[PDB]
Amino acid sequence: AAKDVKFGNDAGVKMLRGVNVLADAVKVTLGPKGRNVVLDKSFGAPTITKDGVSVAREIELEDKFENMGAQMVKEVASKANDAAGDGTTTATVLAQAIITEGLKAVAAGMNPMDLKRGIDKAVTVAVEELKALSCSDSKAIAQVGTISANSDETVGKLIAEAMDKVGKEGVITVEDGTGLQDELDVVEQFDRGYLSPYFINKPETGAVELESPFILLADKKISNIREMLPVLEAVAKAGKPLLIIAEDVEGEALATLVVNTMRGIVKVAAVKAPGFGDRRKAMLQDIATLTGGTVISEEIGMELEKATLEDLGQAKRVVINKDTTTIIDGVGEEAAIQGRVAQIRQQIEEATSDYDREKLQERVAKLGVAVIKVGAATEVEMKEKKARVEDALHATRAAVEVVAGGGVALIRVASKLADLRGQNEDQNVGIKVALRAMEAPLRQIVLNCGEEPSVVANTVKGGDGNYGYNAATEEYGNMIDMGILDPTKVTRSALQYAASVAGLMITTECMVTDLPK
Amino acid sequence: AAKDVKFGNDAGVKMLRGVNVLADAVKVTLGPKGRNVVLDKSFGAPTITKDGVSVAREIELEDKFENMGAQMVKEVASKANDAAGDGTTTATVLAQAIITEGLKAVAAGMNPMDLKRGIDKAVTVAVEELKALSCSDSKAIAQVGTISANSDETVGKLIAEAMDKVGKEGVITVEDGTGLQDELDVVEQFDRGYLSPYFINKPETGAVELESPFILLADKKISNIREMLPVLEAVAKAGKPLLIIAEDVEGEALATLVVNTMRGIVKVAAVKAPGFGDRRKAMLQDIATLTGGTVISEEIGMELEKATLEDLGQAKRVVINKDTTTIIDGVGEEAAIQGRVAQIRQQIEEATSDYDREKLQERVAKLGVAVIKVGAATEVEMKEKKARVEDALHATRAAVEVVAGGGVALIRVASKLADLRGQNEDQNVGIKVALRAMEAPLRQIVLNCGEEPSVVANTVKGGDGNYGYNAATEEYGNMIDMGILDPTKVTRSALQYAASVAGLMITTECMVTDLPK
Amino acid sequence: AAKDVKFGNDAGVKMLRGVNVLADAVKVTLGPKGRNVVLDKSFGAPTITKDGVSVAREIELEDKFENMGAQMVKEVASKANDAAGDGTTTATVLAQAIITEGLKAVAAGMNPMDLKRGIDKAVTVAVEELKALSCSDSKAIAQVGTISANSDETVGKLIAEAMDKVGKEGVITVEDGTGLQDELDVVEQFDRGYLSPYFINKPETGAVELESPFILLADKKISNIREMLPVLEAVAKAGKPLLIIAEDVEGEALATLVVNTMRGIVKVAAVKAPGFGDRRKAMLQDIATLTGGTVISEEIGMELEKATLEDLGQAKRVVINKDTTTIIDGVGEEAAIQGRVAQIRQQIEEATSDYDREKLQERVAKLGVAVIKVGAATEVEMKEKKARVEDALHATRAAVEVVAGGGVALIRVASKLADLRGQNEDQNVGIKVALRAMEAPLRQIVLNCGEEPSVVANTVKGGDGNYGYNAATEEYGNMIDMGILDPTKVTRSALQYAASVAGLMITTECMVTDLPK
């Protein structure tokens, strides 16, 4: 359709307004004194939140261009959430700060490209400086978990031990307990999410759950639909849920499965094979050995139509997040899986490239799941405990993949980079833009407290090291001694993502959108 | 869709107007001199009420933001109604008073967080002070019941004895009498309501009633629909009504059942299993023993499809309120149920944690229903008597879960807390905001009488103890001697819920809603 | 949807306008000199009436609030019509008068509650005073009947004898004659109307007529539809009409029957069982004995599906009014019915409570119908005679359940209550409001004549006793000697209903309605 095009400054103003609308709505929920935000529910009473992520999801503007700006900075929160699993609001306040001052410098005549270069330089030097000041050990892992579950020491300990058993990389799932106590057991996960939403049968978690499903392993991309019908019929009996782990399921057959899940029971859930090219099919073999199935390869491609339930692997349970699929308890234990492990473990011995050995080591490391059965007290208490552990786990994993909290770490880092220079004046301005934005988080936390940000900032900048401002007690002191910590992971992730999106927007010279007319 | 966002004061004004529209409409019906409110019926003559709850349900505003405020304070009434079962209008007048003065203090510059803290402190000290001045014994239980049934001593006595027989926790139901007199008999209830409305075949009571229904007990969450079809067909003969007490019925299979109840007879009604985790399935076993059925567990999950009518328990009648399900007269009396009781009663002896014993004690306490057959006079008189006992019972249960009425209790409590202070000025203001709101109920009762609230309030505050103002006779005197009492339960519940919702609104800094454009 | 709320005066004005629009339109048809009102027919020539009830039914206003007021006062006419069966226009003029002056006093500052109390006091003292001045005997019954049939002495006599044969409580029906003369015969009725309209196959009478229908007697509430299908099929042959006298037919199965009556022949008509609780089912047994059927009780509930035509009672004819169902000529005469009478007649001997004996006496009194075959002259004359007797009967029954007419009775009553006082000034004002309204009827009758109401009123108030104004001859004199009488029943009913609705409106402080926007 007819488009609307805006260049330079005209496009810059529309972007700035859009980011301000989103950022302002989000930033009010920062810190222990974060204010509430009312999100109008389609039906019933409105939602009350202090959670930034929840607020951002609702932000969409009428002005096509402003909305573009809001959707661009919304990428900061989502990316930081996907990486660190926390600190999205901090990322949003940092992004806005860099964009605000960045665009103002552009309007002043500064070179967009130079500005970006200066900002990027400040961020690289900042992250390394952040490392110097610095969630690896179980002490920290247990400390983060408890914090994520309202100081519940029980939950933090369960997570720490869970990660200590299967490694801070292994698959971990939370299940219901069987009469009090807290159980932990490894009962025999790849980076692939559902090819399309809607498969999400549990909207609250944004994940797909399948109980005792069959797993169709294919080495080709499904698009034909029709030749899949005979396999679907076979799965329609007993094991209702079906998990398709093919090379890829094209929009053709994929759209058919999506339309079939609606109304027609649980049906099927589709994801793509882990890895690519050569290692893709060898990786599929590992899944086949776990689940006890047969991979329908190129030559067996004709067989895709006459694939019996014997060729379909099976598992006790499977959970598919946005970008992670975990197969819990596969059917083909010991003998099969262990023999597979013996082969690959012998592959590393066949010394070739150091690369191969690393990749093969990842495979043997993958071939079980560690289930955490929660404290089964009464009935409702067990449901809450599971809700606590579930959220606390998710937050700890992101925290794993500490520095003084309250935004003092970034301020302390900015003080060190005061002499940082670039190749020119514009690059120097960009550097200072980044350093001024590193004060934004603390200033916003203080602003929400009802105190003057300029004063508190000045005082903390006057202090040294872990000297910061406790927004909870309205008192200054040693942040770490007061227990106000931030994983170095969430802090650097928030800064890096804020700077990348901000860098893109500052480098933008033209915007195109469908005309309202 | 595109949203509309408002911050601070802009959002505060919209909220205040919304709460004022709801509160003002509701508060006119407070006390013995409560005014009428006309609710326009879609068809026929408009509804005339002095019942606050009925009025609030109709309140919905055009301005998206104002409506948000109205729906927020509407939560006070609903929560207080769910807890105390009375005093919703009092709760609404208290909420408005706290919100009005709270937001005004915010606009004046006060710190929202500090204000909330002061209010909360005043409420905690107030409730304990309220306890000092203080529906446990049967005297009070019988006194409340009569009051709920227009001074009908007959009804109050039936309820008092009913609660004395199965305990003020046990299940009680009202049925039709068999030729005059008033019968009471325990004929062999968990906190779970219908997973979705529409199942409510009796709109007047807001509950679901099933006569001689089959009870499908499952230990897994239903979502497949299809595998439920064979069981539904079996129930389609003889025992038309079906009650599904599964771990949970997901929106998939749930939505199918909801669409099937419409037009297709009574069909099925769904609720979730009592408790959670470990005790959930042990609790299901107790229901299975009562109804004489078999619980379809994890392993028996495949059997869910081939579950015969022999596995389905059965009862004489079942009533499902918003948050309570009561199974009246199960089929499997004596032997089965009594043996089950013997096991659990022997579990408490096996001393482990004091916790377990408490939970196990709750189970043995649960394993009958006490039916109240009303005074069967003529025909229509019996219908009214049942209507009286039914409402009087509901109000008494909430009253169970006394202080001077006429809003004098809260005023007397506020006088004691005159020296209450906080950590700062803002916290002191919040405290006073709460104390000024404690006069609202009496002032509103007097306002409806046509008398000057400031004068009557001043006079009662000048008195001592139970000295209050009788709004019915327009005379001052000892409230308790005049028979104007209020259950301490309804009073503290009204104050606590008013303060919580008010605390949230005062802490709100941003509102988001779908744009009208 | 979004609502519109109005308080106090704002709501009072909207109500007053609405009542004025309805009352003014209605009151022009009062008395012998009543003016005509044109009611626009959807198709064809407009309706011309001097009948107030017909006019009121058409009144509906655009302004949501004003319409609420009109629909509220419309309740006066309908209630008085249901009780006295006449005097609706008088009731409407009384209501308007009380509401007009009542609301004006409220706006003046008077206390709404006090006002209501004064009005109520004036009405109670007025009705007893009305009794002192006072359709029991057959003389009056015959006098009212003739008056209702245009002075046709024939009709008045038939009704008087009909009521003398089965009592002024017994069931009476009008049928076509068989060759001149006027027959009267008792050929072997409960307070229950059709559960839903639409069943009304005769719109002109607002009643349902069934010829030789089967009667399904059930002791449970039907809602299942499906289990009723087999019984409906059995009735689909021969005896097309079906009458369901169950405990109650819930909206589920009820809505299905309503949709089936449309297009699908006469089908079924549903009503609920007479009485409630214990006496409900004993009362059903009495109907079963009359019609010669079997009552499907609780235990026989399963049999509801396999209920043969043998279990269905049968009658010659059945008529279901708004609130009355009459079974004409049941099949099971003498032996069956007489034996049933012997049991209950022996129940009264078993002296227990005086209450039981009264209720049992009502049952034996109920166990026939008195048919009135009209003067069969030519063909068309017989149709008119039946139309006369039918209307004259209906009016006489209401008249049974005399004082000077022309509104002089109420004026004479108001003169006596001139010294009536209350507990305060506001209560005294309310009293006077009621006394001034008692002149409204006469003033309106005179106003329609074209004469000055203030003058005629003054003159009648100057007279004594039955001294009144004959609006027909435009002459003063003794009302009773002139034959202008009013049943004390219609007069007190008109006043009481006018005062009750007026009391509610004056006590109204808030109105809520769906927003036009």
Side-chain angles (χ1 to χ4, degrees):
Chain A
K3 312 291 179 181
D4 196 344
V5 187
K6 281 179 174 294
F7 296 84
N9 179 257
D10 294 66
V13 296
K14 289 306 185 66
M15 282 193 280
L16 190 55
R17 302 179 196 285
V19 307
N20 279 350
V21 178
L22 173 131
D24 287 6
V26 174
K27 70 181 185 183
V28 298
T29 69
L30 186 64
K33 299 300 188 62
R35 312 295 178 85
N36 288 108
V37 174
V38 186
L39 309 177
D40 193 44
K41 274 274 192 176
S42 307
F43 184 60
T47 300
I48 312 289
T49 44
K50 298 165 103 68
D51 184 18
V53 194
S54 304
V55 179
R57 297 178 181 193
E58 302 295 291
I59 304 302
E60 186 181 324
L61 297 70
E62 183 166 59
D63 183 289
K64 291 283 186 59
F65 293 98
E66 292 177 0
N67 188 47
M68 289 178 85
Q71 303 304 319
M72 289 189 265
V73 288
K74 208 290 178 189
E75 281 291 274
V76 184
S78 54
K79 283 177 181 176
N81 192 231
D82 287 352
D86 191 69
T88 67
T89 307
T90 294
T92 308
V93 309
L94 285 170
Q96 177 191 28
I98 302 177
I99 293 171
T100 296
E101 299 305 307
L103 296 182
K104 277 171 65 183
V106 177
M110 260 91 262
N111 186 288
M113 305 301 275
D114 278 326
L115 288 172
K116 177 180 170 58
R117 273 191 287 280
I119 297 172
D120 298 335
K121 185 182 177 66
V123 180
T124 57
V125 181
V127 296
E128 64 181 67
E129 180 65 73
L130 189 60
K131 293 303 171 185
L133 305 185
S134 181
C135 181
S136 52
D137 54 14
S138 294
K139 310 172 192 60
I141 298 175
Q143 194 180 266
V144 175
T146 61
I147 290 177
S148 309
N150 297 130
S151 299
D152 192 10
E153 229 297 290
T154 308
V155 176
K157 198 167 188 175
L158 286 170
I159 303 170
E161 294 182 332
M163 295 190 109
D164 187 71
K165 192 174 266 193
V166 291
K168 52 181 180 178
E169 189 69 41
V171 194
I172 305 175
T173 313
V174 190
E175 301 188 332
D176 303 79
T178 326
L180 268 189
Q181 306 164 80
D182 283 282
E183 276 102 81
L184 175 57
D185 194 43
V186 177
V187 297
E188 290 285 298
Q189 183 183 235
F190 51 99
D191 289 84
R192 290 293 190 203
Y194 42 76
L195 290 174
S196 62
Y198 302 103
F199 284 157
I200 307 172
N201 58 348
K202 292 190 303 182
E204 300 294 272
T205 317
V208 190
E209 181 195 13
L210 301 173
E211 294 210 295
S212 299
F214 281 112
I215 305 175
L216 192 292
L217 301 163
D219 203 41
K220 47 160 290 193
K221 61 218 313 296
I222 291 85
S223 180
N224 56 352
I225 317 163
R226 293 250 331 98
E227 309 200 288
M228 268 288 290
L229 294 179
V231 191
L232 304 181
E233 290 176 45
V235 184
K237 298 200 162 303
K240 326 288 282 168
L242 179 62
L243 179 62
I244 300 176
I245 305 180
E247 185 180 280
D248 183 57
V249 184
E250 296 179 68
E252 286 73 62
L254 189 64
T256 310
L257 298 172
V258 174
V259 102
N260 275 206
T261 49
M262 312 305 272
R263 277 44 165 212
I265 12 178
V266 258
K267 271 297 178 304
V268 196
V271 295
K272 51 191 304 170
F276 67 110
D278 242 292
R279 68 168 198 183
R280 168 195 296 280
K281 26 186 181 173
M283 196 81 123
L284 274 172
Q285 232 308 113
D286 299 336
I287 301 178
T289 321
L290 281 188
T291 61
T294 314
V295 187
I296 290 87
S297 52
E298 289 287 82
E299 48 190 78
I300 312 181
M302 288 67 239
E303 293 278 325
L304 190 280
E305 195 165 37
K306 47 186 176 178
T308 343
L309 294 182
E310 303 168 89
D311 305 302
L312 280 55
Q314 191 165 23
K316 182 182 70 59
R317 183 179 174 241
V318 175
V319 186
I320 324 175
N321 276 28
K322 302 181 189 295
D323 46 86
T324 351
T325 295
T326 178
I327 304 170
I328 308 170
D329 191 283
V331 184
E333 302 167 309
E334 207 174 90
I337 303 167
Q338 205 52 67
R340 195 68 182 146
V341 170
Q343 295 183 312
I344 309 175
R345 185 171 296 294
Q346 204 243 321
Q347 303 285 279
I348 66 177
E349 296 298 283
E350 303 179 301
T352 42
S353 291
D354 199 62
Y355 222 76
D356 289 298
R357 286 177 292 235
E358 303 300 295
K359 289 288 177 280
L360 298 169
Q361 277 293 270
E362 292 180 25
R363 302 202 300 157
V364 289
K366 286 186 172 61
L367 272 72
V369 182
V371 295
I372 299 181
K373 300 176 174 299
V374 295
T378 62
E379 171 67 277
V380 187
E381 293 185 38
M382 181 277 278
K383 295 297 178 181
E384 168 52 49
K385 175 118 289 183
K386 184 178 179 181
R388 260 177 164 158
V389 185
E390 190 181 273
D391 285 58
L393 174 64
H394 164 266
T396 301
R397 284 187 169 206
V400 171
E401 60 187 280
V402 298
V403 291
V408 311
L410 289 172
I411 281 189
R412 184 183 171 188
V413 171
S415 301
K416 305 289 179 59
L417 317 186
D419 304 284
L420 186 64
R421 296 305 137 105
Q423 302 172 297
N424 56 71
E425 293 83 45
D426 294 340
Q427 294 197 5
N428 287 146
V429 178
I431 289 174
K432 299 301 179 183
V433 171
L435 304 186
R436 281 171 49 79
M438 297 170 103
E439 297 182 34
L442 178 145
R443 288 181 178 266
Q444 190 56 222
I445 290 173
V446 176
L447 187 58
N448 289 333
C449 293
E451 302 302 312
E452 299 180 293
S454 51
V455 181
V456 172
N458 181 63
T459 303
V460 178
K461 293 169 68 175
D464 300 284
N466 297 354
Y467 182 73
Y469 176 80
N470 189 320
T473 60
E474 236 81 291
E475 301 292 306
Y476 292 93
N478 187 297
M479 301 308 271
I480 295 192
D481 294 345
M482 301 192 273
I484 307 169
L485 313 173
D486 270 340
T488 312
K489 185 190 177 64
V490 307
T491 299
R492 72 148 182 81
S493 299
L495 183 71
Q496 294 176 314
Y497 281 126
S500 60
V501 174
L504 295 175
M505 295 190 57
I506 294 175
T507 309
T508 292
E509 252 298 308
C510 177
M511 296 176 89
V512 181
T513 307
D514 284 277
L515 190 65
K517 303 177 182 179
Chain B
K3 311 291 179 181
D4 196 344
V5 187
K6 281 179 174 294
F7 296 84
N9 179 257
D10 294 66
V13 296
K14 289 306 184 66
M15 282 193 280
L16 190 55
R17 302 179 196 285
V19 307
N20 279 350
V21 178
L22 173 131
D24 287 6
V26 174
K27 70 181 185 183
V28 298
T29 69
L30 186 64
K33 299 300 188 62
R35 312 295 178 85
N36 288 108
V37 174
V38 186
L39 309 177
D40 193 44
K41 274 274 192 176
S42 307
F43 184 60
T47 300
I48 312 289
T49 44
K50 298 165 103 68
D51 184 18
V53 194
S54 304
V55 179
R57 297 178 181 193
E58 302 295 291
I59 304 302
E60 186 181 324
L61 297 70
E62 183 166 59
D63 183 289
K64 291 283 186 59
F65 293 98
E66 292 177 0
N67 188 47
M68 289 178 85
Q71 303 304 319
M72 289 189 265
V73 288
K74 208 290 178 189
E75 281 291 274
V76 184
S78 54
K79 283 177 181 176
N81 192 231
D82 287 352
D86 191 69
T88 67
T89 307
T90 294
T92 308
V93 309
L94 285 171
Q96 177 191 28
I98 302 177
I99 293 171
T100 296
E101 299 305 307
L103 296 182
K104 277 171 65 183
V106 177
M110 260 91 262
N111 186 288
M113 304 301 275
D114 278 326
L115 288 172
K116 177 180 170 58
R117 273 191 287 280
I119 297 172
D120 298 335
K121 185 182 177 66
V123 180
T124 57
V125 181
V127 296
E128 64 181 67
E129 180 65 73
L130 189 60
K131 293 303 171 185
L133 305 185
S134 181
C135 181
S136 52
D137 54 14
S138 294
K139 310 172 192 60
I141 298 175
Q143 194 180 266
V144 175
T146 61
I147 290 177
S148 310
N150 297 130
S151 299
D152 192 10
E153 229 297 290
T154 308
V155 176
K157 198 167 188 175
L158 286 170
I159 303 170
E161 294 182 332
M163 295 190 109
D164 187 71
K165 192 174 266 193
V166 291
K168 52 181 180 179
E169 189 69 41
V171 194
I172 305 175
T173 313
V174 190
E175 301 188 332
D176 303 79
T178 326
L180 268 189
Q181 306 164 80
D182 283 282
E183 276 102 81
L184 175 57
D185 194 43
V186 177
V187 297
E188 290 285 298
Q189 183 183 235
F190 51 99
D191 289 84
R192 291 293 190 203
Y194 42 76
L195 290 174
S196 62
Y198 302 103
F199 284 157
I200 307 172
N201 58 348
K202 292 190 303 182
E204 300 294 272
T205 317
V208 190
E209 181 195 13
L210 301 173
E211 294 210 295
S212 299
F214 281 112
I215 305 175
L216 192 292
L217 301 163
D219 203 41
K220 47 160 290 193
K221 61 218 313 296
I222 291 85
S223 180
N224 56 352
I225 316 163
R226 292 250 331 98
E227 309 200 288
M228 268 288 290
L229 294 179
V231 191
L232 304 181
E233 290 176 45
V235 184
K237 298 200 162 303
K240 326 288 282 168
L242 179 62
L243 179 62
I244 300 176
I245 305 180
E247 185 180 280
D248 183 57
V249 184
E250 296 179 68
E252 286 73 62
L254 189 64
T256 310
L257 298 172
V258 174
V259 102
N260 275 206
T261 49
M262 312 305 272
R263 277 44 165 212
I265 12 178
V266 258
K267 271 297 178 304
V268 196
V271 295
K272 50 191 304 170
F276 67 110
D278 242 292
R279 68 168 198 183
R280 167 195 296 280
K281 26 186 181 173
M283 196 80 123
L284 274 172
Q285 232 308 113
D286 299 336
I287 301 178
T289 321
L290 281 188
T291 61
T294 314
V295 187
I296 290 87
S297 52
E298 289 287 82
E299 48 190 79
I300 312 181
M302 288 67 239
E303 293 278 325
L304 190 280
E305 195 165 37
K306 47 186 176 178
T308 343
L309 294 182
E310 303 168 89
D311 305 302
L312 280 55
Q314 191 165 23
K316 182 182 70 59
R317 183 179 174 241
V318 175
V319 186
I320 324 175
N321 276 28
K322 302 181 189 295
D323 46 86
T324 351
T325 295
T326 178
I327 304 170
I328 308 170
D329 191 283
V331 184
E333 302 167 309
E334 207 174 90
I337 303 167
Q338 205 52 67
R340 195 68 182 146
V341 170
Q343 295 183 312
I344 309 175
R345 185 171 296 294
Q346 204 243 321
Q347 303 285 279
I348 66 177
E349 296 298 283
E350 303 179 301
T352 42
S353 291
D354 199 62
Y355 222 76
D356 289 298
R357 286 178 292 235
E358 303 300 295
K359 289 288 177 280
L360 298 169
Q361 277 292 270
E362 292 180 25
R363 302 202 300 157
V364 289
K366 286 186 172 61
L367 272 72
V369 182
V371 295
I372 299 181
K373 300 176 174 299
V374 295
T378 62
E379 171 67 277
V380 187
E381 293 185 38
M382 181 277 278
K383 295 297 178 181
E384 168 52 49
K385 175 118 289 183
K386 184 178 179 181
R388 260 177 164 158
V389 185
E390 190 181 273
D391 285 58
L393 174 64
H394 164 266
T396 301
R397 284 187 169 206
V400 171
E401 60 187 280
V402 298
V403 291
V408 311
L410 289 172
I411 281 189
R412 184 183 171 188
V413 171
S415 301
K416 305 289 179 59
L417 317 186
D419 304 284
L420 186 64
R421 296 305 137 105
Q423 302 171 297
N424 56 71
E425 293 83 45
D426 294 340
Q427 294 197 5
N428 287 146
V429 178
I431 289 174
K432 299 301 179 183
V433 171
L435 304 186
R436 281 171 49 79
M438 297 170 103
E439 297 182 35
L442 178 145
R443 288 181 178 266
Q444 190 56 222
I445 290 173
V446 176
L447 187 58
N448 289 333
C449 293
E451 302 302 312
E452 299 180 293
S454 51
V455 181
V456 172
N458 182 63
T459 303
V460 178
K461 293 169 68 175
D464 300 284
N466 297 354
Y467 182 73
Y469 176 80
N470 189 320
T473 60
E474 236 81 291
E475 301 292 306
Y476 292 93
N478 187 297
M479 301 308 271
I480 295 192
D481 294 345
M482 301 192 273
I484 307 169
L485 313 173
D486 270 340
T488 312
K489 185 190 177 63
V490 307
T491 299
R492 72 148 182 81
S493 299
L495 183 71
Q496 294 176 314
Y497 281 126
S500 60
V501 174
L504 295 175
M505 295 190 57
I506 294 175
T507 309
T508 292
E509 252 298 308
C510 177
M511 296 176 89
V512 181
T513 307
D514 284 277
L515 190 65
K517 303 177 182 179
Chain C
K3 311 291 179 181
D4 196 344
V5 187
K6 281 179 174 294
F7 296 84
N9 179 257
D10 294 66
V13 296
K14 289 306 185 66
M15 282 193 280
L16 190 55
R17 302 179 196 285
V19 307
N20 279 350
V21 178
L22 173 131
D24 287 6
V26 174
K27 70 181 185 183
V28 298
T29 69
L30 186 64
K33 299 300 188 62
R35 312 295 178 85
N36 288 108
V37 174
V38 186
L39 309 177
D40 193 44
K41 274 274 192 176
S42 307
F43 184 60
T47 300
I48 312 289
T49 44
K50 298 165 103 68
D51 184 18
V53 194
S54 304
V55 179
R57 297 178 181 193
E58 302 295 291
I59 304 302
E60 186 181 324
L61 297 70
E62 183 166 59
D63 183 289
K64 291 283 186 59
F65 293 98
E66 292 177 0
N67 188 47
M68 289 178 85
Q71 303 304 319
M72 289 189 265
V73 288
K74 208 290 178 189
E75 281 291 274
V76 184
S78 54
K79 283 177 181 176
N81 192 231
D82 287 352
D86 191 69
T88 67
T89 307
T90 294
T92 308
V93 309
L94 285 170
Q96 177 191 28
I98 302 177
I99 293 171
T100 296
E101 299 305 307
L103 296 182
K104 277 171 65 183
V106 177
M110 260 91 262
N111 186 288
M113 304 301 275
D114 278 326
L115 288 172
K116 177 180 170 58
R117 273 191 287 280
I119 297 172
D120 298 335
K121 185 182 177 66
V123 180
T124 57
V125 181
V127 296
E128 64 181 67
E129 180 65 73
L130 189 60
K131 293 303 171 185
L133 305 185
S134 181
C135 181
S136 52
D137 54 14
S138 294
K139 310 172 192 60
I141 298 175
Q143 194 180 266
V144 175
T146 61
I147 290 177
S148 309
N150 297 130
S151 299
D152 192 10
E153 229 297 289
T154 308
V155 176
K157 198 167 188 175
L158 286 170
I159 303 170
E161 294 182 332
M163 295 190 109
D164 187 71
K165 192 174 266 193
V166 291
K168 52 181 180 178
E169 189 69 41
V171 194
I172 305 175
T173 313
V174 190
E175 301 188 332
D176 303 79
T178 326
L180 268 189
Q181 306 164 80
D182 283 282
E183 276 102 81
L184 175 57
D185 194 43
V186 177
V187 297
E188 290 285 298
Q189 183 183 235
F190 51 99
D191 289 84
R192 291 293 190 203
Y194 42 76
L195 290 174
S196 62
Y198 302 103
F199 284 157
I200 307 172
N201 58 348
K202 292 190 303 182
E204 300 294 272
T205 317
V208 190
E209 181 195 13
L210 301 173
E211 294 210 295
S212 299
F214 281 112
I215 305 175
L216 192 292
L217 301 163
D219 203 41
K220 47 160 290 193
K221 61 218 313 296
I222 291 85
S223 180
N224 56 352
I225 316 163
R226 293 250 331 98
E227 309 200 288
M228 268 288 290
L229 294 179
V231 191
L232 304 181
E233 290 176 45
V235 184
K237 298 200 162 303
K240 326 288 282 168
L242 179 62
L243 179 62
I244 300 176
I245 305 180
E247 185 180 280
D248 183 57
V249 184
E250 296 179 68
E252 286 73 62
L254 189 64
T256 310
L257 298 172
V258 174
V259 102
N260 275 206
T261 49
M262 312 304 272
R263 277 44 165 212
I265 12 178
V266 258
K267 271 297 178 304
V268 196
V271 295
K272 50 191 304 170
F276 67 110
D278 242 292
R279 68 168 198 183
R280 168 195 296 280
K281 26 186 181 173
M283 196 81 123
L284 274 172
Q285 232 308 113
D286 299 336
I287 301 178
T289 321
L290 281 188
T291 61
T294 314
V295 187
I296 290 87
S297 52
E298 289 287 83
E299 48 190 78
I300 312 181
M302 288 67 239
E303 293 278 325
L304 190 280
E305 195 165 37
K306 47 186 176 178
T308 343
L309 294 182
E310 303 168 89
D311 305 302
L312 280 55
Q314 191 165 23
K316 182 182 70 59
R317 183 179 174 241
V318 175
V319 186
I320 324 175
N321 276 28
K322 302 181 189 295
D323 46 86
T324 351
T325 295
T326 178
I327 304 171
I328 308 170
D329 191 283
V331 184
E333 302 167 309
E334 207 174 90
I337 303 167
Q338 205 52 67
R340 195 68 182 146
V341 170
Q343 295 183 312
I344 309 175
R345 185 171 296 294
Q346 204 243 321
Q347 303 285 279
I348 66 177
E349 297 298 283
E350 303 179 301
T352 42
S353 291
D354 199 62
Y355 222 76
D356 289 298
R357 286 177 292 235
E358 303 300 295
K359 289 288 177 280
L360 298 169
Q361 277 293 270
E362 292 180 25
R363 302 202 300 157
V364 289
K366 286 186 172 61
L367 272 72
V369 182
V371 295
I372 299 181
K373 300 176 174 299
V374 295
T378 62
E379 171 67 277
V380 187
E381 293 185 38
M382 181 277 278
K383 295 297 178 181
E384 168 52 49
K385 175 118 289 183
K386 184 178 179 181
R388 260 177 164 158
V389 185
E390 190 181 273
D391 285 58
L393 174 64
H394 164 266
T396 301
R397 284 187 169 206
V400 171
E401 60 187 280
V402 298
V403 291
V408 311
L410 289 172
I411 281 189
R412 184 183 171 188
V413 171
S415 301
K416 305 289 179 59
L417 317 186
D419 304 284
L420 186 64
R421 296 305 137 105
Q423 302 172 297
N424 56 71
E425 293 83 45
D426 294 340
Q427 294 197 5
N428 286 146
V429 178
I431 289 174
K432 299 301 179 183
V433 171
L435 304 186
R436 281 171 49 79
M438 297 170 103
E439 297 182 35
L442 178 145
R443 288 181 178 266
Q444 190 56 222
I445 290 173
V446 176
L447 187 58
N448 289 333
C449 293
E451 302 302 312
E452 299 180 293
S454 51
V455 181
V456 172
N458 182 63
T459 302
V460 178
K461 293 169 68 175
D464 300 284
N466 297 354
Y467 182 73
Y469 176 80
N470 189 320
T473 60
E474 236 81 291
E475 301 292 306
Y476 292 93
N478 187 297
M479 301 308 271
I480 295 192
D481 294 345
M482 301 192 273
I484 307 169
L485 313 173
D486 270 340
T488 312
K489 185 190 177 64
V490 307
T491 299
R492 72 148 182 81
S493 299
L495 183 71
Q496 294 176 314
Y497 281 126
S500 60
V501 174
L504 295 175
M505 295 190 57
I506 294 175
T507 309
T508 292
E509 252 298 308
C510 177
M511 296 176 89
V512 181
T513 307
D514 284 277
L515 190 65
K517 303 177 182 179

